[model samples]
Target chain A: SPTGLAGSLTNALSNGLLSGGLLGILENLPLLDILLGKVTSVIPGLNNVIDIKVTDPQLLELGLVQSPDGHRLYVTIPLGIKLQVNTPLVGASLLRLAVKLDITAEILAVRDKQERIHLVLGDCTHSPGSLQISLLLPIQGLLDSLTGILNKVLPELVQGNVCPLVNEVLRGLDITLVHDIVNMLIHGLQFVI
Target chain B: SPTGLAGSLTNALSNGLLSGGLLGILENLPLLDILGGLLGKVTSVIPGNNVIDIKVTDPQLLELGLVQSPDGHRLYVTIPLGIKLQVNTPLVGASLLRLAVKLDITAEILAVRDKIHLVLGDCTHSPGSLQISLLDGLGPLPIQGLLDSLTGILNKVLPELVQGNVCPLVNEVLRGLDITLVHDIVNMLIHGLQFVI
Candidate 1:
């Protein structure tokens, strides 16, 4: 009985509640617009600096995995980033970089007496991986150095920008509505059977 | 994975939503009083339609079971009814007959669109040995024989008659639930979660 009931419930959640839910929500959000801003960093030697502007980011995957503690929400997004490099070692050039961001968060469902189920976020992690890099105006020598620098910096930079938004989305979701409805369905099943 | 999900869900349902649900609902219902009234009406028809009053004895309790089938849900009800039939008659004067009836009922639940209906499927009764206390009379043998025949007739007739009245009571309970509202709430929940795969 437990297995049957649970199987039906999880099927409803996986196939019904979660399918494209997060994706649709993300599509409506101004996520790309928020990520479009420029990040500038200045290195000490010879006043070397780089300004990277993020462009249209595509959501590749969004999924939820159940764990012992709670649900893990993971999202993968690939972004088109344009960068302007300024250093004494290389000539000025416009470069386009392929970057992908992977983010995951543990979401805990908590209910209060006031008829609300809050999704509390815990331990968010994000990693930015450089996929393919190319120069708009065929530039050499600096590609290897730029790749090395980006590999070191992109993960930390994207994580800093994305975690807050993840928290915001989790907080904004009305989990109470979902929880109450599912509870009602379970109760109906028990009463009917 | 399904096992883990199922275990947590069953735990949530059993401990959380169901802790005081059914018992609390049963407490609020005046089920015994309703059953007494229904039984009074059914049993009265036996004495040439001479309306008899039924006094429900102690522990007026009902046991209910809900089972699932492919077509719909089936509800099996077992009611242990301890009653005393009181009637005024010229033949036996005023008398009391103690009846212990075990009523078994099978009902089908139907949900068509927003409406929920309980259709009575089959109902039968097991009447225990009827105990009669007769008034003082010189016609002891004839009156005893009459009472014995009445008991036999009641056993056969009560089972057929009670089925008619018991059903309306079940449908009456269904009326207590707002069908449209329940349907709307459940639909809203499903639609909201329909996007999740």
Candidate 2:
């Protein structure tokens, strides 16, 4: 089963909200810094459970095609996400999580009276779909010893508390990517009808 | 008798397609870039790489629509899409190597073209993208700064590969498979004559 991710806007601000533990993102996320090489000074002190550092994202798959089925557009995304999820558990234990996911987006291409191409998106819903995951918790002090034991422990950790987290990210993606892809096809396409 | 779409996405939601059919694309993938290279039509901007392994996990058939052809007429084709797969290129680093040090990649597939061409792309490294290639065995090194440098470069290079080869490569394979399937269907109809080869 996947982890439950139904966080309210306020609840998210209160406790161990966003699966990503980095509250810095709530204020001065280093994202802009990473891409630009400019580091931001961030201060941490709040009601959040603990700070999580999300870093080193990699793209595992991306593809697009004109289908043999109909005039439609479908996008499949299998995203691999890593996290340094810190928590108050045993005085600040950090959970390193690895997750892989597949998300589906289906859309119908339509020609308005203007002969201009338009899209009707389908089942943009994210699911627990096929998720391969592992969550490894290395107690703050045991971070070193844990490395020695990592080999033996990782295989079992693969099926931990990651499914729900994976799906949460997937569902949240439809919000932003849905718009980007729509724009991408519109701009790159010569004709949509 | 069919446009050749069946369960391309049959149970994509439940089980990933991860099909092997797309893996053989490496053979033809380099052709376009190489041919253009010899013609002096290719530029240095597009990085060279043809080696790629693919697994298509789901194939789904979606809706249909009308598109304008070059001669300027309405042409309709089944625009099915589904088949989520991950592509991994090993990263060279300071760490002593082992399969133990691996990266988890989140991949997305999009169709760039249909009538003239098509493309399935590389995953994004943006917040939109997710990566866990550097885990367990990976550690912070003095070269961490340099690794960051390479990440920026890869970010640009992978997408360039997508735009250059994906469309022609997949189309060629899709055409080959379609012809093979069509050939079998036609052969079944003939009484004795082996006509089209």
Candidate 3:
């Protein structure tokens, strides 16, 4: 009975996706509860977003203990999203609505001064809805590569559109904001417990 | 004759005094020189006289370090009188005329309090004449005996008189022009010699 409409919808979509049919599945099944549950799990703590500012580049450089020859970045993804529910029936339905879906993949990279590179990719599930992602790469070479990748891939990802969907999602958030929110939610279950 | 008129007068008076004829002795004799030599030998600094002032009291009490007690009054006499004879004749006679006379005797006595008692006597020659005398029975004593003697003698021989007639003679020469010649001669001898006391 805890399998509310949203949980059922999420399960159906997951099943459909696994079955290799991405389109028409949502049109065949108009389950608002299942859709809501899927959306809540995917975008946990989206409204808890706050302002973020990137420290000045020069200040960041000055704060470094030493000039690093290379830097590293890392990332993490959390699982088992919690949607605030006011009543027992609603909460039970929300729990039942939860689809046993694995968290998203996190990607990071590190590149040394000699251009020797390493990459990390990971997935997490059944965890708190908080994650961290980082990259460790050579300073000068990584900066050059990132500049090149932005120029090359950014245009392709947008495909001449007026505004890319990814741009819209990341519009007001800075790298530091992304970092904080991810860290907070990765450890979010600690607060709940 | 080396004996001058003063010597003749001394002889004449010796004879008169022996003859019991007071008139002749008192007559043509130069009573002044006789009286002068006797008194000078005992009490004065005669011509060519060398007197030394010695700090007899302290050295005797402290004992010159070489002795257990320096029980003798310390009288210091120079080995030779440091004098210069200017006249050829006097220079020749100076050695024979040398006089080593002890003028002052200082007695140091320590009793209930420390006291210094001095005893003075008359010289037997003229004031500034040379006289050779013995230092018989003249010396220091132990502290107790010295204090006792000092007490016994203080009334009879007060401190002023203990300095002797030397002071009076010095005063006389200072007052009289006739004595100036003698004073000058004595001064010449003293100036030539370095007297340390």
Candidate 4:
């Protein structure tokens, strides 16, 4: 809807305009610490149990996508996880695994009971990919049988724990604040112009 | 260097931040119309008074990349030009020929006389940027041949026209940008916010 100079100046007022650029803060976020913090206890499975620890989180892609339904931010992160597996026959064995999580959250700006605007994440989905489990010590037969089950169980565990963590991380971010700051900038510019 | 909240706020003072956001305004501007107003009149070129009126339309900024230099800011812009050439006479036949030209323009932003000005640098065209096609049905047998010849001529002439005409017009429009006022405005906002902290 931009016509000329005035339109260009005023178009800067829209929150969506600044959100795309301001959202770059997500790139440098401490995603691993937050995810690891949320997931601490041992993940119990049938026949055996495994204690998982996530490390070295790498952000692949993070951006906002506008669809016919609404705006949603999509995030893809690959993480290194160290696991300690305890079997009935063999006490405890260490394993390394690589897991990637793809998360999408619906961006929402809604009014609370007090008539205050809040930016919150709504209808979030978290799915895990690239769930590869490897052995620490070179004993192929020790955990080959466990790899198949661990692959299936790890994704579900990651999805279960990380979904809420992803939601929490997103909830902590305030697009409304970004909107206000950008709005103030436009108003300030208008005054100066 | 980022120290704290103050560092982040002051970092925004770098021309790069404002330049990046402000450069978005360039995409929305209709450069064709603005340049046309200054050019005095539209143009036509062909053989035997076979006038082909060339009217540039829908000038859009495809991509913008801003880099900082020691003296000032360096801007690289990828622009698309929707050039419409119409031939009124039957020799070439009446047709609206659409020409797609992608312009890669580089400029340096420098402050002079208390104002910001864009000094146009190397302006070049992309490969196959001089693409052409008839809007409606085919004109005639001779028209096809004439079209080929016109393409050859345009390929030779348009880039020079862009360098000669477009560059200077951009400088003219962006001249006297009042950078002092802009600096004052940003300072005022930062000062006010600093007080709150």
In order, candidate lDDTs are 0.41, 0.33, 0.24, 0.41
What docking class should model 4 receive? incorrect
Clashes of each: 9, 46, 43, 0
Candidates, ranked, TM-score? 1, 4, 2, 3
lDDT, residue B46, candidate 4 = 25
Stretches of candidate 1 above 4 Å error?
Answer: A1-50, A68-92, A110-118, A127-138, A175-193, B1-197
Fraction of native Cα contacts kept in each candidate? 0.00, 0.00, 0.00, 0.00
Ten-residue region with minimum lDDT total, candidate 2 chain B: B1-10
Candidate 3 vs 4: which has more lDDT: 4
Worst 10 residues of 3 chain A by lDDT: A57-66
Q: How would you encode candidate 3's per-residue C-alpha lDDT over B1-197 as one tens digit per residue?
A: 11111122223223322344322222222212321635744653556434221211111111111101133222121111111111111322221211122223222111121231211123122223222232222233322333344224332332233223222332222233222222321222222221111
Can you tell me which runs of candidate 3 are displaced by over 4 Å? Answer: A1-193, B1-157, B164-166, B174-180, B183-197
Chain B TM (all candidates): 0.42, 0.32, 0.18, 0.46
Residue clash pairs of candidate 1: A14-B197, A15-B197, A16-B196, A17-B196, A18-B196, A18-B197, A19-B195, A19-B196, A19-B197
For model 1, state the Cα shift of residue A8 in Å. Answer: 16
- What DockQ results do all the predictions give, each relative to the true complex? 0.02, 0.01, 0.00, 0.02
* Candidate 2 Cα lDDT to native: 0.33
TM-score of chain B of 2: 0.32
Report the Cα lDDT for residue A47, model 3.
39
Chain B structural similarity as TM-score, candidate 3:
0.18
